[PDB]
mmCIF file with all atom_site columns, C-alpha atoms in Angstrom:
data_model
loop_
_atom_site.group_PDB
_atom_site.id
_atom_site.type_symbol
_atom_site.label_atom_id
_atom_site.label_alt_id
_atom_site.label_comp_id
_atom_site.label_asym_id
_atom_site.label_entity_id
_atom_site.label_seq_id
_atom_site.pdbx_PDB_ins_code
_atom_site.Cartn_x
_atom_site.Cartn_y
_atom_site.Cartn_z
_atom_site.occupancy
_atom_site.B_iso_or_equiv
_atom_site.pdbx_formal_charge
_atom_site.auth_seq_id
_atom_site.auth_comp_id
_atom_site.auth_asym_id
_atom_site.auth_atom_id
_atom_site.pdbx_PDB_model_num
ATOM 1   C CA . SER A 1 1   ? -135.279 184.331 -89.935 1.00 0.00 ? 1   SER A CA 1
ATOM 2   C CA . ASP A 1 2   ? -132.386 186.783 -89.678 1.00 0.00 ? 2   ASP A CA 1
ATOM 3   C CA . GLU A 1 3   ? -131.624 188.091 -86.187 1.00 0.00 ? 3   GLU A CA 1
ATOM 4   C CA . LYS A 1 4   ? -131.248 191.590 -87.722 1.00 0.00 ? 4   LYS A CA 1
ATOM 5   C CA . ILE A 1 5   ? -130.149 194.163 -85.167 1.00 0.00 ? 5   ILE A CA 1
ATOM 6   C CA . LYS A 1 6   ? -132.027 195.726 -82.282 1.00 0.00 ? 6   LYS A CA 1
ATOM 7   C CA . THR A 1 7   ? -131.722 196.622 -78.617 1.00 0.00 ? 7   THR A CA 1
ATOM 8   C CA . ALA A 1 8   ? -133.233 194.499 -75.854 1.00 0.00 ? 8   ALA A CA 1
ATOM 9   C CA . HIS A 1 9   ? -135.362 197.426 -74.695 1.00 0.00 ? 9   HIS A CA 1
ATOM 10  C CA . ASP A 1 10  ? -136.798 198.037 -78.166 1.00 0.00 ? 10  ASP A CA 1
ATOM 11  C CA . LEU A 1 11  ? -137.911 194.420 -78.528 1.00 0.00 ? 11  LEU A CA 1
ATOM 12  C CA . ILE A 1 12  ? -139.363 194.346 -75.019 1.00 0.00 ? 12  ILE A CA 1
ATOM 13  C CA . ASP A 1 13  ? -141.211 197.611 -75.617 1.00 0.00 ? 13  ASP A CA 1
ATOM 14  C CA . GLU A 1 14  ? -142.712 196.303 -78.862 1.00 0.00 ? 14  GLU A CA 1
ATOM 15  C CA . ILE A 1 15  ? -144.326 193.293 -77.185 1.00 0.00 ? 15  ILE A CA 1
ATOM 16  C CA . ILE A 1 16  ? -145.520 195.329 -74.195 1.00 0.00 ? 16  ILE A CA 1
ATOM 17  C CA . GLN A 1 17  ? -147.367 197.728 -76.486 1.00 0.00 ? 17  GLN A CA 1
ATOM 18  C CA . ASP A 1 18  ? -148.991 194.833 -78.320 1.00 0.00 ? 18  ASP A CA 1
ATOM 19  C CA . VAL A 1 19  ? -150.217 193.438 -75.002 1.00 0.00 ? 19  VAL A CA 1
ATOM 20  C CA . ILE A 1 20  ? -151.791 196.775 -74.089 1.00 0.00 ? 20  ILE A CA 1
ATOM 21  C CA . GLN A 1 21  ? -153.508 196.936 -77.472 1.00 0.00 ? 21  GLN A CA 1
ATOM 22  C CA . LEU A 1 22  ? -154.604 193.319 -77.058 1.00 0.00 ? 22  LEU A CA 1
ATOM 23  C CA . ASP A 1 23  ? -156.518 194.430 -73.958 1.00 0.00 ? 23  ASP A CA 1
ATOM 24  C CA . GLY A 1 24  ? -160.253 194.667 -74.653 1.00 0.00 ? 24  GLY A CA 1
ATOM 25  C CA . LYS A 1 25  ? -163.792 193.865 -73.529 1.00 0.00 ? 25  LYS A CA 1
ATOM 26  C CA . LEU A 1 26  ? -162.469 190.367 -72.787 1.00 0.00 ? 26  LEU A CA 1
ATOM 27  C CA . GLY A 1 27  ? -163.728 189.421 -69.313 1.00 0.00 ? 27  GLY A CA 1
ATOM 28  C CA . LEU A 1 28  ? -162.343 187.099 -66.641 1.00 0.00 ? 28  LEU A CA 1
ATOM 29  C CA . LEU A 1 29  ? -163.468 184.049 -68.609 1.00 0.00 ? 29  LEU A CA 1
ATOM 30  C CA . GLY A 1 30  ? -161.636 185.350 -71.663 1.00 0.00 ? 30  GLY A CA 1
ATOM 31  C CA . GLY A 1 31  ? -158.492 185.599 -69.559 1.00 0.00 ? 31  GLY A CA 1
ATOM 32  C CA . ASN A 1 32  ? -156.950 186.887 -66.323 1.00 0.00 ? 32  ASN A CA 1
ATOM 33  C CA . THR A 1 33  ? -156.613 190.536 -65.269 1.00 0.00 ? 33  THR A CA 1
ATOM 34  C CA . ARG A 1 34  ? -153.617 192.353 -63.789 1.00 0.00 ? 34  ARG A CA 1
ATOM 35  C CA . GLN A 1 35  ? -152.984 195.846 -62.426 1.00 0.00 ? 35  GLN A CA 1
ATOM 36  C CA . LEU A 1 36  ? -150.735 197.986 -64.609 1.00 0.00 ? 36  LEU A CA 1
ATOM 37  C CA . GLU A 1 37  ? -147.678 199.565 -62.999 1.00 0.00 ? 37  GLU A CA 1
ATOM 38  C CA . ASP A 1 38  ? -149.378 202.905 -63.568 1.00 0.00 ? 38  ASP A CA 1
ATOM 39  C CA . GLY A 1 39  ? -152.289 201.487 -61.540 1.00 0.00 ? 39  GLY A CA 1
ATOM 40  C CA . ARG A 1 40  ? -154.510 200.933 -64.592 1.00 0.00 ? 40  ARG A CA 1
ATOM 41  C CA . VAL A 1 41  ? -156.680 197.807 -64.611 1.00 0.00 ? 41  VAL A CA 1
ATOM 42  C CA . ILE A 1 42  ? -156.224 195.772 -67.808 1.00 0.00 ? 42  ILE A CA 1
ATOM 43  C CA . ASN A 1 43  ? -157.308 192.369 -69.148 1.00 0.00 ? 43  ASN A CA 1
ATOM 44  C CA . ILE A 1 44  ? -155.059 189.968 -71.059 1.00 0.00 ? 44  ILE A CA 1
ATOM 45  C CA . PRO A 1 45  ? -154.688 186.137 -71.586 1.00 0.00 ? 45  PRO A CA 1
ATOM 46  C CA . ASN A 1 46  ? -153.192 184.163 -68.706 1.00 0.00 ? 46  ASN A CA 1
ATOM 47  C CA . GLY A 1 47  ? -150.104 183.740 -70.890 1.00 0.00 ? 47  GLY A CA 1
ATOM 48  C CA . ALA A 1 48  ? -149.831 187.507 -71.287 1.00 0.00 ? 48  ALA A CA 1
ATOM 49  C CA . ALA A 1 49  ? -149.882 187.746 -67.497 1.00 0.00 ? 49  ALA A CA 1
ATOM 50  C CA . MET A 1 50  ? -146.930 185.356 -67.297 1.00 0.00 ? 50  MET A CA 1
ATOM 51  C CA . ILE A 1 51  ? -144.688 187.622 -69.377 1.00 0.00 ? 51  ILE A CA 1
ATOM 52  C CA . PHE A 1 52  ? -146.133 190.632 -67.567 1.00 0.00 ? 52  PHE A CA 1
ATOM 53  C CA . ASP A 1 53  ? -144.747 189.305 -64.297 1.00 0.00 ? 53  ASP A CA 1
ATOM 54  C CA . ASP A 1 54  ? -141.389 188.742 -65.997 1.00 0.00 ? 54  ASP A CA 1
ATOM 55  C CA . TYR A 1 55  ? -141.328 192.413 -66.985 1.00 0.00 ? 55  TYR A CA 1
ATOM 56  C CA . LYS A 1 56  ? -141.796 193.386 -63.340 1.00 0.00 ? 56  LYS A CA 1
ATOM 57  C CA . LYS A 1 57  ? -138.761 191.275 -62.459 1.00 0.00 ? 57  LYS A CA 1
ATOM 58  C CA . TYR A 1 58  ? -136.630 193.296 -64.822 1.00 0.00 ? 58  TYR A CA 1
ATOM 59  C CA . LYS A 1 59  ? -137.620 196.342 -62.770 1.00 0.00 ? 59  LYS A CA 1
ATOM 60  C CA . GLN A 1 60  ? -137.363 194.576 -59.415 1.00 0.00 ? 60  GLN A CA 1
ATOM 61  C CA . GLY A 1 61  ? -133.911 193.374 -60.449 1.00 0.00 ? 61  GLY A CA 1
ATOM 62  C CA . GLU A 1 62  ? -134.867 189.739 -59.986 1.00 0.00 ? 62  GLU A CA 1
ATOM 63  C CA . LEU A 1 63  ? -134.178 189.139 -63.683 1.00 0.00 ? 63  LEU A CA 1
ATOM 64  C CA . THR A 1 64  ? -131.854 190.838 -66.153 1.00 0.00 ? 64  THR A CA 1
ATOM 65  C CA . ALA A 1 65  ? -133.016 192.524 -69.351 1.00 0.00 ? 65  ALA A CA 1
ATOM 66  C CA . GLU A 1 66  ? -131.828 189.533 -71.364 1.00 0.00 ? 66  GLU A CA 1
ATOM 67  C CA . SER A 1 67  ? -132.991 187.057 -68.730 1.00 0.00 ? 67  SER A CA 1
ATOM 68  C CA . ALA A 1 68  ? -136.517 188.438 -68.832 1.00 0.00 ? 68  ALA A CA 1
ATOM 69  C CA . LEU A 1 69  ? -136.440 188.422 -72.626 1.00 0.00 ? 69  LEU A CA 1
ATOM 70  C CA . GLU A 1 70  ? -135.075 184.886 -72.620 1.00 0.00 ? 70  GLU A CA 1
ATOM 71  C CA . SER A 1 71  ? -137.825 183.733 -70.263 1.00 0.00 ? 71  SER A CA 1
ATOM 72  C CA . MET A 1 72  ? -140.503 185.262 -72.499 1.00 0.00 ? 72  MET A CA 1
ATOM 73  C CA . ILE A 1 73  ? -139.112 183.521 -75.577 1.00 0.00 ? 73  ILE A CA 1
ATOM 74  C CA . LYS A 1 74  ? -139.063 180.042 -74.003 1.00 0.00 ? 74  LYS A CA 1
ATOM 75  C CA . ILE A 1 75  ? -142.616 180.291 -72.659 1.00 0.00 ? 75  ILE A CA 1
ATOM 76  C CA . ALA A 1 76  ? -143.739 181.910 -75.895 1.00 0.00 ? 76  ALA A CA 1
ATOM 77  C CA . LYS A 1 77  ? -142.593 178.857 -77.832 1.00 0.00 ? 77  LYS A CA 1
ATOM 78  C CA . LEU A 1 78  ? -144.528 176.589 -75.487 1.00 0.00 ? 78  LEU A CA 1
ATOM 79  C CA . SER A 1 79  ? -147.634 178.742 -75.901 1.00 0.00 ? 79  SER A CA 1
ATOM 80  C CA . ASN A 1 80  ? -147.175 178.727 -79.667 1.00 0.00 ? 80  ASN A CA 1
ATOM 81  C CA . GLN A 1 81  ? -146.774 174.953 -79.621 1.00 0.00 ? 81  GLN A CA 1
ATOM 82  C CA . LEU A 1 82  ? -150.126 174.534 -77.871 1.00 0.00 ? 82  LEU A CA 1
ATOM 83  C CA . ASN A 1 83  ? -151.703 176.979 -80.325 1.00 0.00 ? 83  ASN A CA 1
ATOM 84  C CA . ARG A 1 84  ? -150.424 174.895 -83.238 1.00 0.00 ? 84  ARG A CA 1
ATOM 85  C CA . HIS A 1 85  ? -152.125 171.815 -81.796 1.00 0.00 ? 85  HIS A CA 1
ATOM 86  C CA . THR A 1 86  ? -155.821 171.108 -82.337 1.00 0.00 ? 86  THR A CA 1
ATOM 87  C CA . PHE A 1 87  ? -158.649 173.005 -80.625 1.00 0.00 ? 87  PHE A CA 1
ATOM 88  C CA . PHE A 1 88  ? -156.781 176.196 -81.494 1.00 0.00 ? 88  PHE A CA 1
ATOM 89  C CA . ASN A 1 89  ? -160.147 177.686 -82.447 1.00 0.00 ? 89  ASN A CA 1
ATOM 90  C CA . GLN A 1 90  ? -160.892 178.120 -78.745 1.00 0.00 ? 90  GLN A CA 1
ATOM 91  C CA . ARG A 1 91  ? -158.173 180.771 -78.499 1.00 0.00 ? 91  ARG A CA 1
ATOM 92  C CA . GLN A 1 92  ? -158.795 184.186 -80.046 1.00 0.00 ? 92  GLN A CA 1
ATOM 93  C CA . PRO A 1 93  ? -156.882 184.992 -83.300 1.00 0.00 ? 93  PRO A CA 1
ATOM 94  C CA . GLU A 1 94  ? -155.642 188.254 -81.796 1.00 0.00 ? 94  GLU A CA 1
ATOM 95  C CA . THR A 1 95  ? -153.936 186.366 -78.983 1.00 0.00 ? 95  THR A CA 1
ATOM 96  C CA . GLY A 1 96  ? -152.374 183.951 -81.460 1.00 0.00 ? 96  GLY A CA 1
ATOM 97  C CA . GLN A 1 97  ? -150.893 186.854 -83.407 1.00 0.00 ? 97  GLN A CA 1
ATOM 98  C CA . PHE A 1 98  ? -149.222 188.205 -80.262 1.00 0.00 ? 98  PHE A CA 1
ATOM 99  C CA . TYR A 1 99  ? -147.517 184.891 -79.516 1.00 0.00 ? 99  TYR A CA 1
ATOM 100 C CA . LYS A 1 100 ? -146.252 184.659 -83.092 1.00 0.00 ? 100 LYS A CA 1
ATOM 101 C CA . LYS A 1 101 ? -144.505 188.039 -82.882 1.00 0.00 ? 101 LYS A CA 1
ATOM 102 C CA . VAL A 1 102 ? -142.901 187.190 -79.539 1.00 0.00 ? 102 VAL A CA 1
ATOM 103 C CA . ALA A 1 103 ? -141.501 183.892 -80.823 1.00 0.00 ? 103 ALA A CA 1
ATOM 104 C CA . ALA A 1 104 ? -140.368 185.584 -83.994 1.00 0.00 ? 104 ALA A CA 1
ATOM 105 C CA . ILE A 1 105 ? -138.446 188.183 -82.020 1.00 0.00 ? 105 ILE A CA 1
ATOM 106 C CA . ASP A 1 106 ? -137.765 190.593 -84.842 1.00 0.00 ? 106 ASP A CA 1
ATOM 107 C CA . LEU A 1 107 ? -138.227 194.315 -84.435 1.00 0.00 ? 107 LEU A CA 1
ATOM 108 C CA . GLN A 1 108 ? -137.829 194.833 -88.181 1.00 0.00 ? 108 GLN A CA 1
#
């Protein structure tokens, strides 16, 4: 897939919005919950939480914009790999779609 052309912020923003939309009636069993920077309680898969923390680092200054993006891509591939394996039915299709977009990092 062509790399195309986009800013780091635009790509990061695209995935963040998807995560927010992904939030739903899903309870603790469905996944873990984290407090939004705005102070809004949201629910997302444990994997979503992992990248969420990475985002915070970009703000904290612990990680760079590209470093945070890079970290998300590597873990995204691992998550996608597990999804590809069997017993993928256990995971929700909506969550699978999110991982696919992250791995295929194309703003388009």
